[PDB]
Amino acid sequence: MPAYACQRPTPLTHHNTGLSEALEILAEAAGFEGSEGRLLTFCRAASVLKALPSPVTTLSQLQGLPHFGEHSSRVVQELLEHGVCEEVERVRRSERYQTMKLFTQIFGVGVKTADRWYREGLRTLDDLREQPQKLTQQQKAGLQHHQDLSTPVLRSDVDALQQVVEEAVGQALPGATVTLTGGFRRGKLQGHDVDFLITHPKEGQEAGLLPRVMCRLQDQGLILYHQHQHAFERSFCIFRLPQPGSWKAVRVDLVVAPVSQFPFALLGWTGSKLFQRELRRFSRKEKGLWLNSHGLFDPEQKTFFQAASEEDIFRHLGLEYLPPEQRNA
Ligand SMILES: O=c1ccn([C@@H]2O[C@H](COP(=O)(O)OP(=O)(O)OP(=O)(O)O)[C@@H](O)[C@H]2O)c(=O)[nH]1
Ligand SMILES: [Mn+2]
Ligand SMILES: [Mn+2]
């Protein structure tokens, strides 16, 4: 099995979910403590298990796998022998981890904000609501809707949202396209948000499209929150999704890219986050090119690669093409 996650298929469903879940708790906890090296190490080990064709029943099956050092091996050994890993259970039970998870899950809260709040003695959602001067407007909106935003977004929600976004995009600008990206493009059945990439086949015709889209959605009562950012033009939103007898707040990211950059933006926004990190590391370390959501830059020659498709980018980097459902690293 090759070293980089971008050199191997990682399907949606696999045979090692208990083990990968435990390593990913340790990765997340590492990130909460600012231990970025350890985060990446645990994330990589978990992603190896996701790519295996069979369940790991005994530790022999570890043999020959890259990115499976002593610590990750130890964790798996304890799970196989004892059905539980004490380091993992202590993390689960810890107030620090529980609170960092609570806070960072809220819309508009990252690790540094969550850690600051923790160090200042804040622990609960009510504690945050008692200190509104400490909150950004985005965070206030995340708190207002936290129950719905903690509820997994379903494929059925995605289909309804794609319909209203497509309708608004179509009415504002005939010819403009909407592409579902993120985890749902990778085949996921559930998610934390819905990601859309908007473009138009004529370069420049995408200008000013997003505010017209947003006006249309707002006048239908579909928007609870939006923050328009002029990097790609993007609106990070909370939609009010109608449902039978009720409604549901749902996070939606709308990203506009000029068509020349579309393949790079689709690649970046499709993920997984680890897949894309690995693809960028591969591009730099193995091919000496700098990949991002806007392009593929050769820093020696000072050149940008022209791509019409994701397949072009994979081909140019000397990688076998992986469709989005095999990017679940
Ligand atoms: O601001 C951003 C946010 C996200 N992304 C990139 O967009 C992709 C989607 O980012 P998400 O955070 O939506 O992840 P996801 O769809 O894979 O997972 P769930 O919603 O199911 O939890 C990931 O590859 C991420 O790196 C950006 O490039 N920029
Ligand atoms: Mn997403
Ligand atoms: Mn998103």
From Swiss-Prot:
Give the enzyme class. Answer: transferase
Localization: Nucleus
> What GO terms fall under cellular component here?
nucleoplasm; nucleus
- What are the names of the required cofactors? Mg(2+)
What's in the keyword line of the UniProt record?
DNA damage, DNA recombination, DNA repair, DNA-directed DNA polymerase, Magnesium, Metal-binding, Nucleotidyltransferase, Nucleus, Phosphoprotein, Transferase
* Involved in ssDNA binding: annotated segments: 186-195
Is DNA damage there in the keyword field?
A: yes
Does this entry carry the keyword rRNA processing?
Answer: no
Q: Where is this site: Responsible for the low discrimination between dNTP and rNTP?
A: 268
Q: Where does Mg(2+) bind?
A: 193, 195, 253
Q: Which GO terms describe its molecular function?
A: DNA binding; DNA-directed DNA polymerase activity; metal ion binding
Primary localisation category: nucleus
Q: What is its EC number?
A: 2.7.7.7
Q: Which reaction does it catalyse?
A: DNA(n) + a 2'-deoxyribonucleoside 5'-triphosphate = DNA(n+1) + diphosphate
Q: Which domain of life is it from?
A: Eukaryota
Listed under GO biological process in this entry are: B cell differentiation; DNA recombination; double-strand break repair via nonhomologous end joining; somatic hypermutation of immunoglobulin genes
Q: In which tissues is it expressed?
A: Expressed in a number of tissues. Abundant in thymus.
UniProt family annotation: Belongs to the DNA polymerase type-X family.
| Extra remark beyond the main annotation | DPOLM has a reduced ability to distinguish dNTP and rNTP as substrates, and elongates them on DNA primer strand with a similar efficiency. It is able to polymerize nucleotides on RNA primer strands.
Query: What task does this protein carry out?
Result: Gap-filling polymerase involved in repair of DNA double-strand breaks by non-homologous end joining (NHEJ). Participates in immunoglobulin (Ig) light chain gene rearrangement in V(D)J recombination.
Protein name per the record: DNA-directed DNA/RNA polymerase mu
What is the scientific name of the source organism? Homo sapiens (Human)
Q: Which gene encodes it?
A: POLM
Residue range from the parent sequence: 138 to 494 of 494
